Coordinates of C-alpha atoms (C1' of nucleotides) and ligand atoms in Angstrom, one line a residue:
Chain Q
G1 CA 3.6 -7.5 39.0
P2 CA 4.5 -10.9 37.6
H3 CA 0.9 -11.8 36.5
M4 CA 0.3 -8.3 34.9
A5 CA 0.2 -9.3 31.2
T6 CA 1.9 -6.5 29.2
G7 CA 0.6 -7.2 25.7
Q8 CA 4.0 -8.3 24.3
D9 CA 2.9 -11.7 23.0
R10 CA 2.7 -10.7 19.3
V11 CA 4.8 -9.0 16.6
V12 CA 2.5 -7.0 14.3
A13 CA 3.5 -4.7 11.4
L14 CA 1.5 -2.2 9.4
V15 CA 2.8 -1.5 5.9
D16 CA 1.4 1.6 4.1
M17 CA 2.3 2.7 0.6
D18 CA 3.6 6.3 0.4
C19 CA 1.3 8.7 -1.6
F20 CA -0.1 5.6 -3.3
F21 CA -2.1 6.8 -6.3
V22 CA 0.7 9.4 -7.0
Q23 CA 3.3 6.5 -7.1
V24 CA 1.0 4.5 -9.5
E25 CA 0.9 7.5 -11.9
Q26 CA 4.7 8.2 -11.5
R27 CA 5.6 4.6 -12.4
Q28 CA 3.4 4.9 -15.6
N29 CA 4.6 8.4 -16.4
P30 CA 8.4 9.0 -15.6
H31 CA 7.9 12.8 -16.2
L32 CA 6.0 13.0 -12.9
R33 CA 8.8 11.3 -10.9
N34 CA 10.6 13.3 -8.2
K35 CA 8.3 16.3 -8.8
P36 CA 5.6 18.1 -6.9
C37 CA 2.7 15.9 -8.1
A38 CA -1.0 15.2 -7.1
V39 CA -3.8 13.0 -8.2
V40 CA -7.3 14.6 -8.8
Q41 CA -10.8 13.4 -9.4
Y42 CA -12.7 15.4 -12.1
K43 CA -11.5 18.8 -13.5
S44 CA -14.4 21.1 -14.3
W45 CA -15.2 22.3 -10.7
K46 CA -12.2 24.2 -9.2
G47 CA -9.7 22.0 -11.2
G48 CA -10.7 18.8 -9.6
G49 CA -10.5 17.5 -6.0
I50 CA -7.1 16.3 -4.8
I51 CA -7.0 12.8 -3.2
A52 CA -3.2 12.1 -3.2
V53 CA -0.1 14.3 -2.9
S54 CA 3.6 13.6 -3.4
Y55 CA 6.0 14.6 -0.6
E56 CA 7.6 17.3 -2.7
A57 CA 4.1 18.9 -3.2
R58 CA 3.3 18.5 0.5
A59 CA 6.3 20.8 1.3
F60 CA 4.2 23.6 -0.4
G61 CA 1.1 23.0 1.7
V62 CA -0.7 20.9 -0.9
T63 CA -3.1 18.4 0.8
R64 CA -5.8 15.9 0.2
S65 CA -9.4 17.4 0.0
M66 CA -7.9 20.6 -1.7
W67 CA -9.3 21.8 -5.0
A68 CA -6.6 21.7 -7.7
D69 CA -7.0 25.4 -8.5
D70 CA -6.2 26.3 -4.9
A71 CA -3.3 23.8 -4.8
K72 CA -1.9 25.6 -7.9
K73 CA -2.0 28.8 -5.9
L74 CA 0.3 27.2 -3.3
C75 CA 2.5 25.5 -5.9
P76 CA 2.3 26.8 -9.4
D77 CA 4.5 24.1 -10.9
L78 CA 2.4 21.3 -9.3
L79 CA 1.9 18.5 -11.8
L80 CA -1.5 16.7 -11.9
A81 CA -2.7 13.3 -12.9
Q82 CA -6.5 12.6 -13.3
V83 CA -8.3 9.5 -12.2
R84 CA -9.8 7.6 -15.2
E85 CA -13.4 8.4 -16.0
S86 CA -15.7 5.5 -17.3
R87 CA -19.5 5.5 -17.7
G88 CA -19.6 9.1 -16.5
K89 CA -17.8 8.5 -13.2
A90 CA -14.4 8.1 -11.5
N91 CA -13.0 4.6 -12.1
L92 CA -10.3 3.4 -9.7
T93 CA -9.4 0.1 -11.4
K94 CA -5.8 1.0 -12.0
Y95 CA -5.1 1.6 -8.3
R96 CA -7.0 -1.6 -7.2
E97 CA -4.9 -3.7 -9.6
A98 CA -1.7 -2.0 -8.3
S99 CA -2.9 -2.8 -4.8
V100 CA -3.3 -6.5 -5.6
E101 CA 0.3 -6.4 -6.8
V102 CA 1.6 -5.2 -3.4
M103 CA -0.8 -7.5 -1.4
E104 CA 0.4 -10.6 -3.2
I105 CA 4.1 -9.8 -2.5
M106 CA 3.3 -9.2 1.2
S107 CA 1.4 -12.5 1.4
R108 CA 4.6 -14.4 0.6
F109 CA 6.0 -13.4 4.0
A110 CA 2.9 -13.9 6.2
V111 CA -0.8 -13.9 6.2
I112 CA -2.0 -10.3 5.9
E113 CA -5.2 -8.3 6.7
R114 CA -6.1 -5.9 3.9
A115 CA -7.0 -2.7 5.9
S116 CA -7.4 -0.4 2.9
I117 CA -6.4 -0.1 -0.8
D118 CA -2.8 0.7 0.2
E119 CA -2.1 -0.8 3.6
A120 CA -2.1 -4.1 5.3
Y121 CA -1.4 -5.5 8.8
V122 CA 1.0 -8.5 9.1
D123 CA 1.2 -10.9 12.1
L124 CA 4.9 -11.8 12.2
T125 CA 5.0 -13.7 15.5
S126 CA 5.7 -17.1 13.8
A127 CA 8.0 -15.8 11.2
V128 CA 10.0 -14.1 14.0
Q129 CA 10.3 -17.4 15.9
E130 CA 11.6 -19.1 12.8
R131 CA 14.2 -16.4 12.0
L132 CA 15.3 -16.5 15.7
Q133 CA 15.9 -20.3 15.4
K134 CA 18.0 -19.7 12.3
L135 CA 20.0 -16.9 14.0
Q136 CA 21.3 -19.3 16.7
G137 CA 21.8 -16.5 19.1
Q138 CA 23.7 -14.4 16.6
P139 CA 23.4 -10.6 17.3
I140 CA 21.6 -8.4 14.8
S141 CA 23.7 -6.1 12.7
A142 CA 22.7 -2.5 12.1
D143 CA 23.3 -3.3 8.4
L144 CA 20.2 -5.4 8.5
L145 CA 18.1 -2.4 9.5
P146 CA 19.1 0.3 7.0
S147 CA 15.8 2.2 7.0
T148 CA 14.6 1.6 10.6
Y149 CA 14.0 4.2 13.3
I150 CA 13.7 3.2 17.0
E151 CA 11.1 5.5 18.5
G152 CA 12.4 7.3 21.6
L153 CA 16.1 6.9 20.8
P154 CA 18.7 8.3 20.9
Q155 CA 18.3 9.5 24.5
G156 CA 20.8 11.1 26.9
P157 CA 24.5 11.6 26.0
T163 CA 24.1 14.6 15.8
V164 CA 23.2 17.3 13.3
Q165 CA 22.0 15.2 10.3
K166 CA 18.8 13.1 10.1
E167 CA 20.5 9.9 9.1
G168 CA 23.1 10.4 11.8
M169 CA 20.4 10.6 14.5
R170 CA 18.7 7.5 13.0
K171 CA 21.9 5.5 13.2
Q172 CA 22.6 6.8 16.7
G173 CA 19.3 5.6 18.0
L174 CA 19.6 2.2 16.2
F175 CA 23.0 1.8 17.8
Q176 CA 21.7 2.5 21.3
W177 CA 18.9 0.0 20.7
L178 CA 21.0 -2.8 19.4
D179 CA 23.6 -2.3 22.1
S180 CA 21.0 -2.8 24.8
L181 CA 19.6 -6.0 23.2
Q182 CA 19.7 -9.4 25.0
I183 CA 20.1 -11.9 22.1
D184 CA 20.5 -15.1 24.2
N185 CA 16.7 -14.8 25.2
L186 CA 14.5 -16.2 22.4
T187 CA 11.5 -14.9 24.3
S188 CA 12.7 -11.2 24.8
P189 CA 9.9 -9.0 23.3
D190 CA 12.4 -6.3 22.3
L191 CA 14.5 -8.9 20.4
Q192 CA 11.3 -10.3 18.8
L193 CA 10.3 -6.8 17.6
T194 CA 13.9 -6.3 16.2
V195 CA 13.8 -9.5 14.2
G196 CA 10.3 -8.5 13.0
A197 CA 11.8 -5.2 11.8
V198 CA 14.5 -7.2 9.9
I199 CA 11.7 -9.1 8.2
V200 CA 9.8 -5.9 7.4
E201 CA 13.0 -4.5 5.8
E202 CA 13.0 -7.6 3.6
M203 CA 9.3 -7.2 2.8
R204 CA 9.7 -3.6 1.8
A205 CA 12.8 -4.3 -0.3
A206 CA 10.7 -6.9 -2.2
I207 CA 7.8 -4.6 -2.7
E208 CA 10.1 -1.9 -4.2
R209 CA 12.1 -4.3 -6.3
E210 CA 9.1 -6.0 -7.8
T211 CA 6.7 -3.1 -8.2
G212 CA 8.7 0.2 -8.1
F213 CA 6.6 1.3 -5.1
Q214 CA 8.0 2.6 -1.9
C215 CA 6.3 2.2 1.4
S216 CA 6.6 3.0 5.1
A217 CA 5.9 0.6 8.0
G218 CA 5.4 0.3 11.7
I219 CA 6.5 -2.6 13.9
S220 CA 5.1 -3.1 17.4
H221 CA 3.1 -5.5 19.5
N222 CA -0.4 -4.8 18.2
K223 CA -2.2 -3.1 15.3
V224 CA -2.8 0.4 16.9
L225 CA 0.8 0.8 17.9
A226 CA 2.0 -0.5 14.5
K227 CA -0.2 2.0 12.7
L228 CA 1.0 4.9 14.8
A229 CA 4.6 3.8 14.4
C230 CA 4.2 3.8 10.6
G231 CA 3.3 7.5 10.5
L232 CA 6.2 8.6 12.7
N233 CA 8.9 8.6 9.9
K234 CA 7.2 8.7 6.4
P235 CA 8.3 8.5 3.7
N236 CA 10.3 5.4 2.7
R237 CA 11.2 4.5 6.3
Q238 CA 10.0 2.1 9.0
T239 CA 9.7 2.6 12.8
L240 CA 9.9 0.2 15.7
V241 CA 7.7 1.2 18.7
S242 CA 8.7 -0.9 21.7
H243 CA 6.5 -1.6 24.8
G244 CA 9.0 0.5 26.8
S245 CA 8.7 3.5 24.5
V246 CA 4.9 3.9 25.2
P247 CA 4.9 6.1 28.3
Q248 CA 7.0 8.8 26.8
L249 CA 5.4 8.5 23.4
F250 CA 1.9 8.8 24.8
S251 CA 2.7 11.5 27.3
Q252 CA 2.5 14.2 24.6
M253 CA 0.3 12.3 22.1
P254 CA -3.0 14.0 21.3
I255 CA -5.9 11.6 21.9
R256 CA -7.1 12.1 18.3
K257 CA -4.0 10.6 16.8
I258 CA -4.9 7.1 17.8
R259 CA -6.9 5.2 15.2
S260 CA -10.7 5.4 16.1
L261 CA -10.4 8.4 18.4
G262 CA -10.2 11.1 15.8
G263 CA -14.0 11.7 15.8
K264 CA -16.9 12.1 18.3
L265 CA -15.7 9.5 20.8
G266 CA -12.2 11.1 21.1
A267 CA -13.8 14.5 21.6
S268 CA -16.0 13.1 24.4
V269 CA -12.9 11.5 26.1
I270 CA -11.3 15.0 26.0
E271 CA -14.3 16.9 27.2
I272 CA -15.7 14.5 29.8
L273 CA -12.3 13.7 31.4
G274 CA -10.7 17.1 31.0
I275 CA -7.5 15.7 29.4
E276 CA -5.5 16.2 26.2
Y277 CA -3.0 13.3 25.8
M278 CA -3.3 9.6 25.6
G279 CA -1.0 9.0 28.6
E280 CA -3.4 10.9 30.9
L281 CA -5.9 8.1 30.5
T282 CA -3.8 5.9 32.8
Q283 CA -5.0 7.7 35.9
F284 CA -8.6 6.3 35.5
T285 CA -9.8 2.9 36.5
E286 CA -11.2 0.5 34.0
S287 CA -14.6 0.8 35.6
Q288 CA -14.5 4.6 35.3
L289 CA -13.7 4.5 31.6
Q290 CA -16.5 1.9 31.1
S291 CA -18.9 4.2 32.9
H292 CA -18.3 7.1 30.5
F293 CA -17.6 5.3 27.2
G294 CA -19.4 1.9 27.5
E295 CA -18.1 -1.5 28.4
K296 CA -16.2 -2.2 25.2
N297 CA -14.7 1.2 24.6
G298 CA -13.8 1.6 28.3
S299 CA -11.9 -1.7 28.3
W300 CA -10.2 -0.8 25.0
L301 CA -9.1 2.6 26.4
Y302 CA -7.9 1.2 29.7
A303 CA -5.6 -1.3 27.8
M304 CA -4.6 1.0 25.0
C305 CA -3.3 3.9 27.0
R306 CA -0.9 1.2 28.5
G307 CA 0.2 0.1 25.0
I308 CA -2.0 -3.0 25.1
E309 CA -4.5 -4.0 22.4
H310 CA -5.8 -7.4 21.4
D311 CA -7.5 -6.9 18.0
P312 CA -6.3 -9.8 15.8
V313 CA -4.7 -9.5 12.4
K314 CA -7.5 -11.1 10.3
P315 CA -6.5 -13.5 7.6
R316 CA -8.2 -11.4 4.9
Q317 CA -6.3 -10.3 1.7
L318 CA -9.5 -9.5 -0.3
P319 CA -12.1 -6.7 0.3
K320 CA -15.4 -7.9 1.9
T321 CA -17.6 -5.7 -0.3
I322 CA -17.4 -4.4 -3.9
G323 CA -19.1 -1.0 -4.3
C324 CA -19.8 1.8 -6.8
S325 CA -20.9 5.3 -5.8
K326 CA -21.3 8.8 -7.3
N327 CA -22.3 12.2 -5.8
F328 CA -24.4 14.6 -7.7
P329 CA -23.8 17.9 -5.9
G330 CA -25.7 21.2 -6.2
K331 CA -27.4 21.7 -9.5
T332 CA -26.3 18.3 -10.9
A333 CA -28.7 16.4 -8.5
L334 CA -30.9 13.9 -10.3
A335 CA -34.5 15.2 -10.7
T336 CA -36.1 12.9 -13.3
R337 CA -36.8 9.2 -13.4
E338 CA -34.9 8.9 -16.7
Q339 CA -31.8 10.4 -15.0
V340 CA -32.0 8.2 -11.9
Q341 CA -32.4 5.1 -14.1
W342 CA -29.5 6.1 -16.4
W343 CA -27.1 6.6 -13.5
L344 CA -28.2 3.4 -11.7
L345 CA -27.4 1.6 -14.9
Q346 CA -24.0 3.3 -15.2
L347 CA -23.1 2.3 -11.6
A348 CA -24.6 -1.2 -12.2
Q349 CA -22.5 -1.7 -15.3
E350 CA -19.3 -0.9 -13.5
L351 CA -20.3 -3.2 -10.6
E352 CA -21.1 -6.0 -13.0
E353 CA -17.6 -5.6 -14.6
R354 CA -15.8 -5.6 -11.2
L355 CA -17.9 -8.5 -9.9
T356 CA -17.3 -10.7 -12.9
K357 CA -13.6 -10.1 -12.6
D358 CA -13.8 -10.9 -8.9
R359 CA -15.6 -14.2 -9.5
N360 CA -13.0 -15.2 -12.0
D361 CA -10.0 -14.3 -9.8
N362 CA -11.2 -15.2 -6.3
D363 CA -13.7 -18.1 -6.6
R364 CA -16.6 -16.4 -4.9
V365 CA -20.0 -14.8 -5.7
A366 CA -21.8 -11.9 -4.0
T367 CA -25.4 -12.6 -2.8
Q368 CA -26.8 -9.3 -1.5
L369 CA -27.1 -5.9 -3.2
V370 CA -27.2 -2.8 -1.0
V371 CA -28.7 0.4 -2.5
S372 CA -27.9 3.7 -0.8
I373 CA -29.1 7.1 -1.7
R374 CA -28.8 10.7 -0.4
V375 CA -31.6 13.2 -0.9
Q376 CA -31.1 17.0 -1.2
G377 CA -31.1 18.8 2.1
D378 CA -29.9 15.8 4.2
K379 CA -26.4 16.2 5.6
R380 CA -26.0 12.5 6.5
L381 CA -23.8 10.4 4.3
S382 CA -26.7 8.1 3.5
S383 CA -30.3 9.1 3.5
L384 CA -31.6 5.6 2.9
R385 CA -30.2 2.0 2.7
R386 CA -32.2 -0.9 1.3
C387 CA -30.9 -4.4 0.5
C388 CA -32.2 -6.9 -2.0
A389 CA -31.1 -10.3 -3.4
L390 CA -28.2 -10.4 -5.9
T391 CA -28.8 -13.5 -7.9
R392 CA -27.2 -12.7 -11.3
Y393 CA -24.2 -10.6 -12.4
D394 CA -26.4 -8.6 -14.8
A395 CA -26.2 -4.8 -14.8
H396 CA -29.7 -4.3 -16.2
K397 CA -31.2 -6.6 -13.6
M398 CA -29.2 -5.1 -10.8
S399 CA -30.2 -1.5 -11.8
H400 CA -33.9 -2.5 -12.2
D401 CA -33.8 -4.1 -8.7
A402 CA -32.1 -1.0 -7.2
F403 CA -34.8 1.2 -8.8
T404 CA -37.5 -1.1 -7.4
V405 CA -36.2 -0.9 -3.9
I406 CA -35.7 2.9 -3.9
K407 CA -38.6 4.0 -6.0
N408 CA -40.9 4.6 -3.0
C409 CA -38.6 7.5 -2.0
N410 CA -39.8 9.7 -4.8
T411 CA -42.3 12.1 -3.1
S412 CA -43.3 13.6 -6.5
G413 CA -46.8 12.9 -7.7
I414 CA -45.6 13.2 -11.2
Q415 CA -44.3 10.0 -12.7
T416 CA -41.4 11.7 -14.6
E417 CA -40.0 14.0 -12.0
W418 CA -38.0 12.9 -9.0
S419 CA -38.4 14.9 -5.8
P420 CA -36.6 15.8 -3.8
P421 CA -33.6 15.4 -6.1
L422 CA -31.0 12.7 -5.5
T423 CA -27.5 13.9 -4.6
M424 CA -25.9 10.4 -4.3
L425 CA -26.3 6.9 -5.6
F426 CA -24.4 3.9 -4.2
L427 CA -24.5 0.2 -5.1
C428 CA -22.6 -2.3 -3.1
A429 CA -22.3 -6.0 -3.5
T430 CA -22.0 -7.9 -0.2
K431 CA -22.3 -11.4 1.5
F432 CA -19.8 -13.4 -0.6
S433 CA -20.0 -17.2 -0.8
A434 CA -17.5 -19.6 -2.3
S435 CA -18.2 -20.6 -5.9
Chain C
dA1 C1' -19.5 21.5 -4.6
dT2 C1' -14.8 17.0 -1.4
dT3 C1' -15.5 12.3 -3.6
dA4 C1' -15.3 7.3 -3.7
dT5 C1' -14.8 4.0 -1.3
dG6 C1' -14.3 0.7 2.6
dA7 C1' -14.7 -1.6 7.6
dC8 C1' -17.3 -2.2 11.6
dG9 C1' -20.4 -1.2 15.8
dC10 C1' -25.2 -0.5 17.5
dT11 C1' -30.0 -1.9 18.1
Chain G
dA1 C1' -32.0 -5.3 8.6
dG2 C1' -31.1 -0.4 8.5
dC3 C1' -28.5 3.3 10.6
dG4 C1' -24.3 5.7 12.5
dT5 C1' -19.1 6.2 13.1
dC6 C1' -14.5 6.4 11.5
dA7 C1' -11.3 6.7 8.0
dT8 C1' -9.2 9.1 4.1
Ligands
LIG1 N1 -11.4 8.1 -4.0 C1 -10.7 8.5 -2.9 N2 -9.5 8.0 -2.8 C2 -8.9 8.4 -1.7 C3 -9.4 9.2 -0.8 N3 -8.5 9.4 0.3 C4 -7.4 8.7 -0.1 N4 -7.6 8.0 -1.3 C5 -6.7 7.2 -2.0 C6 -5.5 8.0 -2.5 C7 -4.3 7.5 -1.7 O1 -3.2 7.5 -2.5 C8 -4.8 6.1 -1.2 C9 -4.2 5.7 0.1 O2 -4.6 6.5 1.2 P1 -3.6 7.1 2.2 O3 -2.8 6.1 2.8 O4 -4.5 7.8 3.4 N5 -2.7 8.3 1.5 P2 -1.3 8.2 0.7 O5 -1.0 6.8 0.4 O6 -1.5 9.0 -0.6 O7 -0.2 9.0 1.5 P3 0.7 8.6 2.8 O8 2.1 8.5 2.3 O9 0.5 9.7 3.8 O10 0.1 7.2 3.2 O11 -6.2 6.2 -1.1 C10 -10.7 9.7 -1.0 O12 -11.2 10.6 -0.2 N6 -11.4 9.3 -2.1
LIG2 MN1 -0.4 5.4 2.1
LIG3 MN1 -3.3 4.0 3.8

DNA sequence: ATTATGACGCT
DNA sequence: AGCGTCAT
């Protein structure tokens, strides 16, 4: 009872940009705004592969991983923007720079953890304590939460979406105890006020809209963020977890969408996250290992301890290209030329990183895939990265992979390469 | 012939 | 160190 810690110590937010690459292209080209729009990589094969989709286009069934030609079948007026091509490959620099814009705004409010190109976690615990001090026990007006949903409300005792949103927010605010500066529900609420301000700042200063989740840990904040996209934020309280999880497929929780989640379902004979509560911690550890078992035991009760890492910058800088089917690299000249192309992009990005961020990478990782191997990587080899020079990096990458070529002929490469990947790692302050 | 990235756990 | 998983 009283000693049963409930995982309510922290206020954590997850901010995710809506259809990010599409918004980057819509800002640059106003003709794409408020239209069914998607971003594609390449064009020759089936129109290019879609990697981002505006919400207008999603209404027609357009999705990521779809070929543009098939997307056009579902939505003939779909507009398309293509990723830049440089040195023969897709170049994502425009989106990385737009990402830095958003991350720097978020960092004004709190230290953030960059989780991907378009989303970051925020630990708002201290910021919430400060705003609570300033409030002096003043209640929180619904006017301060103009885009916030309270998951699970309204309940009990109505036709429009905004009306439902405001109804739930009213029930939530009416139930709040604002004289208690340590009430977790109040703390989450103040956290949501701050996230409204953060999202207002992002849209004002970049033009980009985003959604957000506010809860007590990273997994619940991420799940909350997805409940009311786009351009809205969602508060998931500790109390909302039993009902939320009672019908939540296990695969919806981050890290359970793959083989481990399928094994949870198959071994335990369950479907929903809430069903996990009926097992003891030792039972879960016996099936899924000590770490996973402890994590599942806490997480099905809404509890997770993973910290928001103080990290605004990526830990690695990498360059990769697939060479599918008949485009696979089958000569040594080919392999050297593409290693050089990747290495020149890497050099450019690394040099800009050293200038911006006062650090230098010290290890080069070379990954290849060989024809007939279904795995992502057929082989990974590291070597030293001592100079930001593309010719040196590509020569070293060739040296560490050249023993892969089973061809007796010096010129041919067998079996052909269907992927090259260069990744700079192990940064040190410079 | 999804592709181009990341992060992180395991041994 | 090199490999596998998860994401998207
Ligand atoms: N190169 C590449 N980029 C990708 C891929 N998948 C996603 N991206 C890029 C394109 C995406 O714009 C961006 C962010 O990924 P999300 O947050 O998963 N999707 P979004 O922000 O579009 O929509 P939502 O409103 O549902 O959050 O990453 C991929 O497979 N390859
Ligand atoms: Mn997004
Ligand atoms: Mn994202």
